[PDB]
């Protein structure tokens, strides 16, 4: 048995692990270290055409500016969104 | 209340989130009250997990 849960939802009480790194888990995890995750979800409830739109928006945020880690925060958001269109 | 007897404000009214634990952790055993029943209670990343657990209980 393998307990798979986010802080809010519990799914299970073979499994895939992305290193944590925003990536797929097939029996999606945003991050973390039983596998502990901050946002762990379906797979069914991800959308998706908005993940592509959120990717294009984050890439438009990047051509600032400027000061390191802002910047880093935008690239994180880009990495997360890339690994969401990759997922579905 | 912890600071007025002896810092974060705005805790308890809305239910605590992991986002609340993150805010605390980013600023930086843990002591909290563990729920038993209606009457009874008792006194890098996994560090934010432990702040969160002490918030939910």
């Amino acid at each position: 048995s393998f307990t798979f849960a986010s802080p809010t939802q519990v799914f299970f009480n073979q499994v895939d692990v992305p290193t944590l790194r925003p990536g797929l888990v097939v029996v999606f995890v945003s991050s973390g270290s039983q596998l502990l995750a901050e946002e762990a979800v379906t797979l069914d409830m991800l959308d998706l055409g908005a993940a592509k739109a959120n990717l294009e928006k984050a890439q438009s945020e990047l051509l600032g500016a400027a000061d390191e880690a802002t910047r880093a925060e935008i690239q994180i958001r880009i990495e997360a969104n890339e690994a969401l269109v990759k997922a579905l | 209340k912890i600071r007025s007897i002896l810092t974060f404000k705005e805790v308890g009214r809305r239910p605590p989130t992991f986002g609340d634990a993150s805010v605390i952790a980013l600023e930086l055993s843990i002591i909290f009250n563990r729920f038993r029943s209606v009457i009874s209670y008792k006194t890098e990343y996994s560090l934010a997990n432990i702040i969160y657990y002490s918030l939910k209980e």
Partner: peptide, 25 residues
């Protein structure tokens, strides 16, 4: 060493951001 952990940043901020991107999707 990762790009976010250069000037800053903790994995808590990293996690926080990724988590929010999943909720926004």
């Amino acid at each position: 060493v990762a790009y976010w952990r250069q000037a800053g940043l903790s994995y808590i901020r990293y996690s926080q951001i990724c988590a929010k991107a999943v909720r926004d999707a």
